[PDB]
Request: fold
Amino acid sequence: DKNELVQKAKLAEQAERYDDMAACMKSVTEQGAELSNEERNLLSVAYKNVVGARRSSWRVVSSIEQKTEKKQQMAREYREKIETELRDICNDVLSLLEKFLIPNASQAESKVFYLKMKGDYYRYLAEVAAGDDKKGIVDQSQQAYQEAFEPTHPIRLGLALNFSVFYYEILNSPEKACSLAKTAFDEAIAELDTLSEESYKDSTLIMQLLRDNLTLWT
Amino acid sequence: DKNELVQKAKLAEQAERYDDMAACMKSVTEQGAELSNEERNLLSVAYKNVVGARRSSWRVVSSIEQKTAEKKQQMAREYREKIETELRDICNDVLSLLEKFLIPNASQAESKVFYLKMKGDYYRYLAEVAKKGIVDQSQQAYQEAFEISKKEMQPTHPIRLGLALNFSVFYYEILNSPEKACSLAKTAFDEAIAELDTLSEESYKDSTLIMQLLRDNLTLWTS
Amino acid sequence: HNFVRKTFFTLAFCDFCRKLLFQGFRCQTCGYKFHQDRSSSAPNVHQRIGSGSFGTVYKGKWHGDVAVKMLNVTAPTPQQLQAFKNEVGVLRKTRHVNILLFMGYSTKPQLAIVTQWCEGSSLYHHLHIIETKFEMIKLIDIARQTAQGMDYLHAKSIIHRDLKSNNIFLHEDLTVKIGDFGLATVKSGSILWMAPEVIRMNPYSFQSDVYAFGIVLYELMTGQLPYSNINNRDQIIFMVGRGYLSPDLSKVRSNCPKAMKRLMAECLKKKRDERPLFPQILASIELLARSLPKIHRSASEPSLNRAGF
Ligand SMILES: [Zn+2]
Ligand SMILES: [Zn+2]
Reply:
């Protein structure tokens, strides 16, 4: 089936039916076999933007909560509605990559990539959480990111970008975030040279997003 | 009660969460009352996007399904049939609301124009994918909407313009008879232009907006 | 303009400021979206020919189909020779799918370039010798592969100095690649691609290559050089600079996407600072490339300004 399930996923992206792409695509990982370097990107793109639809909507309804009056109750229960769907899909990808993918990539640097995902998905729960869960979740998130270390490679910069923004948005510690982001940015721009075969098409963007995120935090 | 159901809809819209918005508005129709023009509007935009994400998706699938082995081909078609099946269901749903709760109570003059138009549009999408005498069923729904609207609304009214626009593209896209599309579009453009001497201050936008879309369509058929 | 709220599930940019946009708006008739704070994440990723531009061009030959062109007026002084050796010391290193391979330098004085030519015409030929009729999606594709080449040149800070439609070459619709890159040492032919700012007299700006690329999109969309009936270059050249004249956006074919007309229009911005950079252009072209399959052959009734301000 494996050629097929990846086939449906490849279509489902073009159809922009990302929800159905995730439902299919994780059927590949539940084979228990290792993902190809292609399958990994298809899995990550499905779940990210499937959650993306929930994150942006959660931001909007929460914004119009804050701007709000008996309708507040309807808004609050709806925020909890979108929060549970977010929380529930996020637990899924966590359970998947904990249950299967991380223990089955040994010394493929997908071993980094799957830890970075574990960080990101706890990070998304740390946006949803309140004071109680937040620390219990955030501890688990930082263990993932802080372990996610092996140099211009998109992933290493991608971790550094994503991980530095974790420190800024959730720990609210700009010293760490600036420290990381500037450090990682220099180790990119002083070096480059890989770019064409690296597919600079990716790594320059993350390198730029470091520069302008720093420009936001500075 | 609809102050509640309708708040969820207004909330779901800006939450960009249309699949949920269309279900709550359906229960707004379950009250069987004449919808106020705002909750009437929400209902139309809810189901417009809920098909739109799927109909436009169906176009990409049927575009990739052009290309030529069997495994890829039958999956491409099988996937197309699924998205087509989804489109067929939500289409027949809205028509049931129209048939059973809106049209039978569209007492106000414009109200029945809006619902009959929508009965046109939704049959249009269904015949677009579908044996499909539904083309004629949309033709009837538009012709009813046009027959009434020709008398009971101002040639600059946005629904009359918007009806004319949808109906003209029906003649084009579904019947491939562009002279008929030219006829409708040219009339409706010229008639509203002849009425530009008065506009309601919001219709001012929507009318001129729709008119500009109508003038665009004229070009692609006229060139 | 009319607007809807939209989550962008793909790499996309905010037209007001060219920064990444995850969440916000789309102009439902135009794609343009207002810049309406949060830190960014990592996105998802998945024989003679003539005097030439500024070097006399020859269909030279050596192992590997390498054509040749020669210096024009700039003398082979050691300072300029060293600068050429340094520029070659970039171009002879860089290889990229949309760039023609710089193979080496002619060792003799009066420097000359050895570089591959791939069969299939110059883009000048398909435009102005024929106007070869082909599917519009391939027009987007040509714009994509040229843009994705220029994106690497800019990703390497190679500025083209004098980009023209003639120096773009098609592998018989297999691909397009860029010639005439770099080699600014020899600069100072014919000129409609000079940016107005440069013809007001660092004219080889990083963003000047943008404007020249803009002129190429006009030719693709219109089948002709700009200024179809005001053809006296020396008459128009100064006044296209002085603020009178810019290419007629109405001459584009009626079936082009509105957004491509829009892309050209922003590309042709006279004031340099916010002529869009090529990563954003690439994203815009990447949106068009799949938008054209999506968009209907005729328009319809939109949701009426439903979620604007
Ligand atoms: Zn607009
Ligand atoms: Zn922006």
